[PDB]
Specification:
The structure is cut from a larger assembly and holds two copies of chain A.
Chain A lengths: L17 H8 L3 H11 L10
């Protein structure tokens, strides 16, 4: 609603979570880079000690 | 607008139940106006929607 878009047309079992699909529809570097980080935030499995 | 997806689903559901019950008809079904009608308050639409 801020960038002036449709609400959404989202499927229940869509293989993409909404931030993933929204990462590419918008055109704004800040918000899009944020969503990129969020979608690709995940742990690092490392064996220590 | 905020009820969009639900409206889509409602339309599909009415159409499905309608054709399903149409299947169970034996006498041909003509499109002809009638003396007496059936009231439909639009508040009963707004509610449904």
């Amino acid at each position: 609603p801020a960038f002036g878009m449709q609400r959404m047309h989202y499927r229940n079992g869509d293989p993409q979570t909404p931030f993933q699909i929204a990462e590419q529809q918008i055109q704004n570097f800040q918000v899009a880079n944020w969503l990129h980080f969020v979608n690709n935030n995940q742990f690092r499995q490392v064996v220590i000690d | 607008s905020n009820r969009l997806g639900q409206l889509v689903d409602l339309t599909r559901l009415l159409a499905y139940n309608y054709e399903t019950l149409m299947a169970c008809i034996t006498m041909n079904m003509q499109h002809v106006q009638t003396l007496t009608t059936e009231k439909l308050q639009l508040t009963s639409v707004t509610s449904l929607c």
